[PDB]
Amino acid sequence: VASLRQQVEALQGQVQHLQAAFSQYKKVELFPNGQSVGEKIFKTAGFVKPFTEAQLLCTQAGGQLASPRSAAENAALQQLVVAKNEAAFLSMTDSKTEGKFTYPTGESLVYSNWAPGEPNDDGGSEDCVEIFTNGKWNDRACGEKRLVVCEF
Amino acid sequence: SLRQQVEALQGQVQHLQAAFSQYKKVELFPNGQSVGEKIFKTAGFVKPFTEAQLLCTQAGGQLASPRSAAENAALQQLVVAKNEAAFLSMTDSKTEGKFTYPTGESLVYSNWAPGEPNDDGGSEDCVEIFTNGKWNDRACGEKRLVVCEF
Amino acid sequence: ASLRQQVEALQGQVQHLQAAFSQYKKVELFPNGQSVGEKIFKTAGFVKPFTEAQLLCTQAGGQLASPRSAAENAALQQLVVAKNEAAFLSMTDSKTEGKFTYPTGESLVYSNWAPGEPNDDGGSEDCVEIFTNGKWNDRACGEKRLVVCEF
Ligand SMILES: O=P([O-])([O-])O[C@@H]1[C@H](O)[C@H](O)[C@@H](O)[C@H](O)[C@H]1O
Ligand SMILES: O=P([O-])([O-])O[C@@H]1[C@H](O)[C@H](O)[C@@H](O)[C@H](O)[C@H]1O
Ligand SMILES: [Ca+2]
Numbered sequence: 001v002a003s004l005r006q007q008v009e010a011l012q013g014q015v016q017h018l019q020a021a022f023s024q025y026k027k028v029e030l031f032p033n034g035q036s037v038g039e040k041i042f043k044t045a046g047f048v049k050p051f052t053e054a055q056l057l058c059t060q061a062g063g064q065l066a067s068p069r070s071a072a073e074n075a076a077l078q079q080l081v082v083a084k085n086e087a088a089f090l091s092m093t094d095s096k097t098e099g100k101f102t103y104p105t106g107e108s109l110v111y112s113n114w115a116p117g118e119p120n121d122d123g124g125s126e127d128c129v130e131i132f133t134n135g136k137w138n139d140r141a142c143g144e145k146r147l148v149v150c151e152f
Numbered sequence: 153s154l155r156q157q158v159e160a161l162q163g164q165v166q167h168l169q170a171a172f173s174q175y176k177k178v179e180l181f182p183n184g185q186s187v188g189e190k191i192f193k194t195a196g197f198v199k200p201f202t203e204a205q206l207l208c209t210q211a212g213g214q215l216a217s218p219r220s221a222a223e224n225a226a227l228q229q230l231v232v233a234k235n236e237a238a239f240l241s242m243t244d245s246k247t248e249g250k251f252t253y254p255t256g257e258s259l260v261y262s263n264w265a266p267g268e269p270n271d272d273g274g275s276e277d278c279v280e281i282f283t284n285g286k287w288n289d290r291a292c293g294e295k296r297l298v299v300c301e302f
Numbered sequence: 303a304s305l306r307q308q309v310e311a312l313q314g315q316v317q318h319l320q321a322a323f324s325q326y327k328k329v330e331l332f333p334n335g336q337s338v339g340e341k342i343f344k345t346a347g348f349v350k351p352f353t354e355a356q357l358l359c360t361q362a363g364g365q366l367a368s369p370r371s372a373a374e375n376a377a378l379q380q381l382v383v384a385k386n387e388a389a390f391l392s393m394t395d396s397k398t399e400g401k402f403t404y405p406t407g408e409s410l411v412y413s414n415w416a417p418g419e420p421n422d423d424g425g426s427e428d429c430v431e432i433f434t435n436g437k438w439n440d441r442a443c444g445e446k447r448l449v450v451c452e453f
């Protein structure tokens with residue numbers, strides 16, 4: 001009760017210090033390759049890789065390829081693409097069933113920002129998705145190299 | 153009961169303090185410098201002043217603004233490490249011959265190289281810091297290392 | 303009463319902090335870091351001679367990569383492979399030729415020498431590099447290798 005009192009007051013000061021310090025470091029971490037939106041964080045590796053390699057990199061790091069689920073998330077992701085001036089791969093593919101794009105979990109899309117006419121499975125071999133500097137999406141061959149951006 | 157939960161909380165906080173301390177060192181390696189309560193971090197690339205300024209602002213910070221010999225030395229470490237002169241936040245764009253911080257406040261510290269600022273060519277309103285730590289006013293259109301402070 | 307509620311509220315903040323921190327740790331490690339046990343390896347992304355690399359890590363509050371187990375070596379190997387550049391380890395045999403030690407002076411507790419190593423080629427190889435295949439080779443300290451520090 002009494003001793004417990006001080007202990008609680010001491011913890012409050014320690015917690016406040018951690019909160020202030022962490023707040024500062026979050027900003028530091030995101031500069032210049034990250035974007036925070038809601039409770040999601042997008043971070044680019046800064047280089048390009050084919051889809052399979054990009055996917056593995058994100059998976060191994062405990063995240064997954066960028067998967068914008070709203071206009072807000074897509075705009076945040078667009079900021080990184082614009083900054084690096086390099087279109088990036090999204091996590092979604094229609095490799096299982098042509099014409100039906102899904103997230104790595106198999107769930108159907110809850111948001112999309114396809115450029116006019118897309119997806120068009122050009123050449124009959126486009127099962128991956130890239131996001132342009134203007135934020136629009138286009139289905140593209142998974143063998144192509146695009147900016148690696150993961151979400152955590 | 154409450155005494156058992158408090159010890160559990162104490163343990164969680166001690167763990168966080170240890171984990172956070174380790175994480176701070178990791179984050180700052182190799183592009184950051186901690187001095188006092190300020191943190192300097194370089195983006196690792198060069199940009200013209202206006203662009204560099206926007207990058208820092210959008211990140212929730214601002215261009216490096218050394219306010220003491222100690223901060224200037226910390227900033228100097230990053231410049232030396234990348235071997236690339238960097239832009240500071242200060243400019244005399246509003247009133248030629250009078251440098252101020254983004255807020256409009258006058259300088260509280262300066263480390264100008266001999267003869268500077270000299271508004272060379274009548275068009276130097278930005279400031280760069282060299283690997284030796286000294287400052288020189290330069291054209292804002294030139295590209296220099298982007299270093300922000302948080 | 304008020305104390306208990308004050309403690310439960312404090313724990314709510316602490317667990318929220320734990321969650322935020324966990325997310326930011328993963329973000330931090332991507333793509334230049336690797337965590338293994340309580341150790342963290344992080345590459346600077348560039349190459350430097352041994353003395354300079356050692357100074358960079360020391361000044362950052364850590365030390366050059368010092369894998370002490372197969373698990374740590376495999377973790378470090380991931381970074382070397384990602385950068386496709388052999389990296390320097392912290393150990394040297396500068397004090398006593400043929401006897402590699404950590405910066406502390408302690409003898410190795412783990413090694414993963416490539417066949418035929420360490421050979422002290424030219425009679426002047428007192429530093430250690432780790433290849434993309436995870437094997438070690440003694441190399442001249444003047445050579446430039448990927449900088450990887452451990453924290
Ligand atoms: O192959 P390319 O003609 O250079 O470029 C193609 C066009 O931009 C097309 O509109 C788009 O739908 C394809 O995905 C792209 O591959
Ligand atoms: O134009 P430059 O002669 O190559 O270099 C100039 C000189 O170093 C001058 O002393 C300095 O005050 C100017 O800011 C620089 O631009
Ligand atoms: Ca298909």
Ligand SMILES: [Ca+2]
Pocket residue numbers: 094098099121125126127128139
């Ligand atoms: Ca398709």
Ligand SMILES: [Ca+2]
Pocket residue numbers: 118119120121122126138139140
């Ligand atoms: Ca297409």
Ligand SMILES: [Ca+2]
Pocket residue numbers: 244245248274275276277
């Ligand atoms: Ca002027």
Ligand SMILES: [Ca+2]
Pocket residue numbers: 244248249271275276277278289
């Ligand atoms: Ca001027």
Ligand SMILES: [Ca+2]
Pocket residue numbers: 268269270271272276288289290
């Ligand atoms: Ca000048």
Ligand SMILES: [Ca+2]
Pocket residue numbers: 028029178179329330
């Ligand atoms: Ca970081």
Ligand SMILES: [Ca+2]
Pocket residue numbers: 395396399425426427428
């Ligand atoms: Ca020797």
Ligand SMILES: [Ca+2]
Pocket residue numbers: 395399400422426427428429440
């Ligand atoms: Ca030797």
Ligand SMILES: [Ca+2]
Pocket residue numbers: 419420421422423427439440441
């Ligand atoms: Ca050898």
